[PDB]
Structure 1
Amino acid sequence: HPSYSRVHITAQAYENPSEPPMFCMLLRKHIEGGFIEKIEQAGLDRIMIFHI
């Protein structure tokens, strides 16, 4: 989000699953079915690295 950007494990139900955009479709094409190797930070900056 431009003001509310965050990364956390949510617990509430984010409803209205509308028709997915093309970034979500490419994520389901490329990422789904895989495993997560490690979650590490690029130094001390606000950069999150996900190893899939």
Structure 2
Amino acid sequence: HPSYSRVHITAQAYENPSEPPMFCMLLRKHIEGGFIEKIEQAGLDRIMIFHI
């Protein structure tokens, strides 16, 4: 989000759309079912890299 960009584990409940967006379906196609091998930061920039 332009103003509220963040990454964290959340307890909050979220309402999902009745139809999943294209990006969501793409992520599902490629990485749903997969395992997170590593999470790393690109130097000390605000960029997290998930190896899946």
Tell me the distance in 1 between the aligned counterparts of 2:41 and 2:20.
Answer: 29
Number of positions where the alignment pairs a residue of Structure 1 with one of Structure 2: 52
Give TM-score scaled by structure 1 length.
0.91
Residue of structure 1 equivalent to 2:10:
10
List structure 1 segments (4+ residues) > 2 angstroms apart after TM superposition.
none
Residue of structure 2 equivalent to 1:38:
38
Task: Quote the RMSD (CA, aligned, Å).
Answer: 1.0
Instruction: Kindly state the Cα deviation for residue 18 of structure 1 after the two structures are TM-superposed.
Output: 3.0
Which structure 1 residue ranges, 5 or more long, are not aligned? none
Which structure 2 residue ranges, 5 or more long, are not aligned? none
Q: Give the secondary-structure state (helix, strand or coil) at the position aligned to 1:39.
A: strand
| Percent of aligned positions that are identical | 100
